[PDB]
Symmetry: C4
Subunit: 334 residues, 4 copies
């Protein structure tokens, strides 16, 4: 078997060390745009978000309201695929025909032959294979089928890998963007598979950067899961992630499709995992945080502020200049 | 004194990182058979289990019912030896002439001269010297006696060492399989001897493989104790263990020779250690879990599924392909 | 991005290993004076404190009474700047004209143009640019303006950096002393910037000593925040810090400008961060309560006697000797988690 | 300042890995004797203990009863010096003329000119300078006075250091044995006061290495004592395996009937008093005051502990302490493992 020369780490084990902040670096001048899909060197991505946040492919988070709300702020949602092809297709259509908003859709490696056409006809701007382990022939086959039928006209995100090898496989398979994260989810012990979210992102980004140099193709990567604090967003971006996928964070908003409940005088909101027995056959609570616009605005202002402490006016600048340190276990145990 | 460059670790400190899962790797195609006794390169072991689980050499777990139930599922039990030579021989016989089922039996380094013949005559398929410290002349003497009288016809497992040095000694002594594990057991501080189960397995396996390349003799090793969760099974196997010995896991079952009791409305089963003042002169409660068949089925289904995430259809494949990472203490401390 | 070969640590992760104690090293002979502002090789700083303690630039700790009480013990306070220029200047004046006591003042990188002249006129002995991130052109600009107008006549501390790069920048910019500390404060998660206080001090100090070899200029550094126990003082000094800035420690005293409240039988004092909403509007911080400890004098005396005693276990009669002779070891997380 | 390439550790962070146990390595064949004072190569120590256990220099543990009981088991006690010279001297005399028993006495760097002569006259077999920081001129001066007046006739242990530098200094001053341990005692708040100390295991390991170098350099073997930090019996085996010739314990002995403290019932539990020598009461004839569980007679406890130690030694394939120190395989354990 193969072992590693060092243990994996989570976002909570790192801190950013300030760099030179110039007079022109004010939060208001910070550009949070980022590429969603792969593009060739010297060119621009066919799809660019204004903000680096995307909502999780979950019944408890990415519904119509969320897709529209998040799209309005510059992000994009991936309508959960744990429902019938018609339902999803409809939701996608609804978002597109609201008055245009970008919308994504999750797909599986089983019914893609009939699921993809529907989503495409429905107007989905981008798809993403949904899996806890994307390092497999099924994703290669699924992605290959899509290229076979739509060429580069259909954008499909892929996987969920945690190392260079997994990244490499999906990159060669054709994926437009690759998703990172196994076990870091807040609602994730069972199979004993996973890796610290921070280490997974750092390792995958290094591989992605090599790949770019080798092929001239820049494949955006998404840090999926593990975001507990706003500053985790800044760390994920600083470590190389182009955009971030969150579930819990969004589940707490008014726009999520879960019901608002009250527990012990506190207004909560339901939130369950896609791997739970209820979604797979198409569980917990999170504090109600209010409207998406208000929250997203706050989190990103904090992100923008921090970027300037690091001397960065753009995400690529941050990824280049960021100084990141590990923190001792005792420091965290405070 | 001799010191080590790194601290020893437990199974809870590791995670498996997915490998390439080919379309044909589905739980129903995974072969969980594994060798029980040493054989020559290129050949096969004389004894091969259908599943890599064996029950502990303890009064509270390996009785007649356990031996039959587990053998049915494809594993094997080592009838406890903290009882008269006549009693133990009786059990071995009952199991053998039930209607054939393989059964093991534990022996000690004191009365082996009469215990082994009785056990052998009763039809025991394999023996195992039972000790908390197999790194001793007594085990070498015992194996030497069995060889003197039966040559290679009687298979004898041996030890319980936690490093390459102990493994090498027992290998050269002639052991058919070597058991790993000191201080990792659930019901185990007193003498300050032991090692993290994970490091012990990793270290002994490395030595076992060197021995293989040097002699062409592959000696199976058993990871004994320390299994808290099902995923720990996959890890032990991935680290090189050919089979796993468990006590607590099996004590919880209906087939264990202990009585079922009720404590606070919760049905429990008695479970005490072989080092306790009662087994030696021939303690706690574990939750009742039901039938062995149903539990073993669920655990191994998880193991099979995980093996496929790792791209392995067989145990030897898992041991070769497995990517294993250490986890930060902060991560575990969650 | 740039990564570090080792995790940062806090003061609670270190212990001092004793050195040779001489017959004459007794607390009563230990000299605790330390330099406040940069000076050249072989020389003496123009401002030397009798004790290495200074109070934080916070509304909840450095008011007029604190300034007088701490100056009396040999230290110095930095009157908070989260108030109008007239009020702060008034405070400085009252301290200087009490009956003379040294006093400092915090300034910002925004209104320094008129804030500095007023504070200087009011009689402030030293100023300090107050910020959670001093690694910025604004600090260089502020010091530049000051040097342009008063040359070396006005002493100004600067920053709050946590690494050699930050120090080097502020040093070249002209700072009279550089303050270390981001995220180690007791009332500090949000932006995720910072570094363990011990590592920050150790790294900045190493850079400060290199700078000294290169330029012949010694720049005193201040370990700001993170002091929980008295022995943390000795450690901070041992690691290279010339003086220590504290907020919580002093807020607990009778002389702090905050009111006293009773929380379940215990007498407490209010203590809120300057990054909180209320101070900025004259949220990097919180609003808490620290146990009332009594008079500054008694407490400081108790803490320092502890420091002096430890210094002698280390074989040092002076702070510079300590920084030179100290044997410092990291302790296992298990040892701490006891 | 000076820093270290690695963090210090406590005894709880180590485990022993078995070695080859030969058929003849049985508890009843193990030799636990050990040298108490320095000797020259190829020679033997003028004082050898039958068991590597000595009792702390504390009012709460080393009184007359303790001294007699432990000496009977093959060890030795160091009568506490936080009392008048006449009192301490009387106690020593009592033990020596009980019916002969070896006994030790603690001394300080203040009144030694009058204290040493009295203790020697009373018949003390060995003295030991009692201090929390033995790395000082005062200890060298004290030892220098003793050498001047009695040459090598009077044996005196010294200090309490935690590193090679402190060891070397005391070794050069002329100490007959050196005590290791600062911040490891149970009744200590590992310096929430001064921030001085070092993990006991690392302190013993480091001091031992220097001791062995000093030996190769001078031919003089100086025994070292691991003082404090012993919680479990296996810590005893660890300390010895790490190179300690003998162990000094406070809490361990305080729990016994022979300790000079009172037995008191606390929540149905029979306890015994135990306070540090740096606590306000002993200094007025650093530490805290407390209770420990009553454990009964010293003989029964020391027998059980040492049986366990001997047994473990054989798991490591050692019949003697020097063999253990040579063959022991010691591993650090991950912090996660400890947090179990
Ligand atoms: N990120 C995480 O760590 C994590 C853990 S669970 C989880 C989420 O939970 C949800 C469920 O994930 P999942 O990976 O179990 C689902 P996925 O569809 O990838 O796999 C389920 C199973 O069906 C089988 N399968 C897939 N495609 C085929 C096919 N074409 N033909 C035959 N068999 C096939 C596979 O062997 C697999 O075991 C996901 O939506 C995901 O976002 N994420
Ligand atoms: N795996 C563990 O960490 C662990 C701890 S306790 C434990 C279990 O508890 C049970 C008891 O283990 P154990 O090691 O005490 C048993 P073992 O028989 O090995 O030893 C018991 C004692 O008898 C002595 N002895 C053994 N053979 C002889 C002989 N031929 N001549 C003279 N003396 C002899 C040994 O020195 C030993 O002290 C075992 O069944 C084992 O599985 N396992
Ligand atoms: N040490 C810590 O970790 C820490 C955290 S909060 C904190 C304290 O809280 C208080 C507030 O600190 P702070 O860093 O927010 C203050 P500072 O003045 O440095 O920054 C506040 C904001 O105003 C802007 N700003 C400053 N000067 C100018 C200028 N001249 N022109 C245009 N914009 C400008 C900056 O970009 C910054 O976002 C401080 O007193 C400090 O001691 N310390
Ligand atoms: N092991 C530990 O970590 C530890 C902590 S406290 C402790 C115990 O508590 C007790 C008290 O220890 P301690 O170190 O305070 C005592 P010690 O006598 O060694 O020191 C007390 C002080 O008096 C001074 N002093 C000593 N001799 C003289 C002299 N001759 N003339 C003038 N001044 C002098 C020294 O400077 C010293 O600071 C000890 O018995 C010890 O066993 N052990
Ligand atoms: O049932 C589940 N178990 C574990 N992870 C899940 C499950 N459902 C979704 N996830 C993952 O975790 C993310 C959510 O992360 P979160 O933002 O920490 O709640 C999703 O995008 C998935 O990758
Ligand atoms: O009394 C005992 N103390 C410690 N370990 C024991 C004892 N009896 C058996 N064991 C060991 O621990 C295993 C049990 O591991 P478990 O499955 O974690 O309960 C056995 O096979 C033995 O190797
Ligand atoms: O609002 C705030 N948040 C975090 N730190 C603060 C804040 N206000 C002041 N500080 C810092 O922390 C120090 C106080 O540290 P303390 O002594 O640990 O309470 C000050 O000198 C500042 O550098
Ligand atoms: O008051 C005290 N504080 C801290 N340590 C003490 C004190 N009194 C004695 N000691 C030390 O700690 C040992 C006790 O160790 P213990 O066996 O862990 O209780 C003694 O031999 C001393 O070296
Ligand atoms: C040579 C003198 C330089 C003085 C520098 C003053 C910097 C004050 O700061 C400036 O204040 C303005 C008014 O609030 C703002 O609009 C600017 O954005 C801000 O940078
Ligand atoms: C090239 C960009 C120059 C920006 C300089 C803006 C200066 C704004 O003006 C400044 O505002 C400060 C705050 O009120 C005052 O203290 C200064 O005296 C004043 O000059
Ligand atoms: K900055
Ligand atoms: K896979
Ligand atoms: K000293
Ligand atoms: K052994």
């Amino acid at each position: 078997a193969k072992y590693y020369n060092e243990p994996c780490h989570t976002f909570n084990e790192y801190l950013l060390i300030p760099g030179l902040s110039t007079v022109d670096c004010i939060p208001s001048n910070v550009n949070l745009s980022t590429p969603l899909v792969k593009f060739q060197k010297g060119q621009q991505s066919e799809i660019n978000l204004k903000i680096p946040l995307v909502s999780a492919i979950m019944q408890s988070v990415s519904g119509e309201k969320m897709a529209i709300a998040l799209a309005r702020e510059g992000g994009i949602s991936f309508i959960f695929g744990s429902q019938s092809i018609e339902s999803q297709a409809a939701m996608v259509h609804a978002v597109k025909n609201f008055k245009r908003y970008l919308v994504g859709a999750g797909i599986n490696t089983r019914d893609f032959r009939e699921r993809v056409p529907a989503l495409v006809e429905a107007g989905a701007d981008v798809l993403c294979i949904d899996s806890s382990d994307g390092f497999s022939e099924w994703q290669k086959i699924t992605i290959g089928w899509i290229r076979d039928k739509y060429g580069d006209k259909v954008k499909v995100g892929a996987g969920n890998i945690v190392d260079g090898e997994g990244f490499r496989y999906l990159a060669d398979a054709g994926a437009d963007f690759i998703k990172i994260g196994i076990g870091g989810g807040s609602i994730c012990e069972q199979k004993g598979i996973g890796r610290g979210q921070a280490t997974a992102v750092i390792d995958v980004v290094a591989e992605r950067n090599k790949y770019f140099e080798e092929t001239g193709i820049y494949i955006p990567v998404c840090s999926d899961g593990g975001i507990v604090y706003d500053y985790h967003m800044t760390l994920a971006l600083a470590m190389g992630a182009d955009f971030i996928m969150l579930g819990r964070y969004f589940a707490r908003f008014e726009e999520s499709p879960t019901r608002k409940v009250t527990i012990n005088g506190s207004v909560m909101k339901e939130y369950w995992g896609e791997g739970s027995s209820r979604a797979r056959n198409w569980d917990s609570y999170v504090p109600y945080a209010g409207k998406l616009k208000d929250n997203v605005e706050a989190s990103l202002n904090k992100v923008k502020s921090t970027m300037c402490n690091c001397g960065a006016l753009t995400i690529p600048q941050l990824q280049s200049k960021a100084k990141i340190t590990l923190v001792s276990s005792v420091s965290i145990v405070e």
